[PDB]
Copies of this chain bind each other. A is one copy, B any other.
Amino acid sequence: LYYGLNLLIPCVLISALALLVFLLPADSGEKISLGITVLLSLTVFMLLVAEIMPSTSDSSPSIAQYFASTMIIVGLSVVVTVIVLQYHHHDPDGGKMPKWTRVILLNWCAWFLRMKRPGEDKVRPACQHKQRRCSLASVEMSAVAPPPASNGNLLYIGFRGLDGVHCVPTPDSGVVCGRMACSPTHDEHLLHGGQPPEGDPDLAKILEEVRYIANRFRCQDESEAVCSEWKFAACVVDRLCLMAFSVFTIICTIGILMSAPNFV
């Protein structure tokens, strides 16, 4: 009665912790260590195995096969932890070349947020009207800008979209000579009470330095955004590995349960 419980509780707990390690968010600070830490908890347990199946007295290959399979599984998990952490730095050494895994990471992120399976993708409010049709705004295979949206598309084309209307307004809109809203129509005599349009050119340099420091801060902001994106990609890969290993763990448990009468 105590043998089965003492052999099942620790193994089941270790198998559950192995999955919980990946279920944890992308904590690059501790993950790389946590994945190994759990492994240590198994090594000590291996000693107890020597009591029930010594390496020179008892010959029980049945449970030894399952133990070796679990050891290989945890080793592969610890190894893939390093590959996952690799996506957090992207050192210049190379390896995981960019422009290849980004399309897969974006697809995974879109499938996690917007479910794709028939349970929620097909069974949902839909119609055959223009609300689900496609046009020049959807089919952008020719490198067309995205539609105007507040999720990072309206201000994107403006700020990040260099050479656009916000920075290069070459299209003749007629505001410089047709409208007077904050734009005098070819008014060359508009003087600031007898002075030029600018009180002191030093203000221009002050504004330039202010914009320079603002861009310096935006550089760190973009670095933090890239770090967050790398963390999200690592978490997505961890979730994928968890989903993949879930089936293997379930199969191993089913085999150990169905093969228990053969040994016990």
Contact = CB atoms under 8 A, between A and B. Distances in A.
A250 interface: no
Interface residues of A, number: 96
Given A13-B72, A86-B25, A202-B198, A43 B46 contact: no
Interface string A79-101: 10010011011011110000000
A26 to B, nearest CB: 7
Interface of A is mostly: helix
B2 A64 contact: yes
Interface in A1-19: 1-3, 5-6, 9-10, 13, 16-17
Given A16-B79, A92-B232, A200-B200, 7 more contacts: A5-B68, A24-B32, A25-B85, A29-B30, A191-B193, A195-B195, A213-B213
8 contacts: A9-B68, A13-B75, A24-B82, A25-B89, A39-B41, A89-B231, A92-B112, A199-B202
Interface of A: 1-3, 5-6, 9-10, 13, 16-17, 20-21, 23-30, 32-34, 36-41, 43-48, 50-56, 59-61, 64, 68, 71-72, 75, 78-79, 82, 85-86, 88-89, 91-94, 109, 112-113, 191-207, 209-214, 216-218, 221, 231-232, 235-236, 239
